């Protein structure tokens, strides 16, 4: 099982 | 069995 | 960004 | 974006 | 038996 | 791409 | 920024 | 980017 | 399982 | 058994 | 950028 | 298994 997750919010 | 998922709803 | 993948196959 | 398998067959 | 997947959702 | 192949062959 | 990853996969 | 390769054959 | 987070708010 | 998973997101 | 291999292959 | 990842985030 593998679960890869990424967001950019930078300011 | 296998499962992929993936979504893009990045910023 | 989201990527999931799992897997069970005997090997 | 989803893919999914399943097997089962004697080998 | 043999099982081969692959996917390329990379950024 | 998914590729699948299984055999249960005497020999 | 954020980047996620965990496995859980026999090795 | 992913790549999965699973088998299990007598040798 | 590995986390990764930055921000920049810096004056 | 063998799993390769990529992925860049790199800033 | 992240990259993740596995392997289980007796040898 | 092994495991890679970077970041540049610097400034």
Do not use: H, I, P, Q
Not at 2 to 7: D, G, R, S
């Amino acid at each position: 099982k593998l679960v890869f997750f990424a967001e950019n919010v930078g300011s």
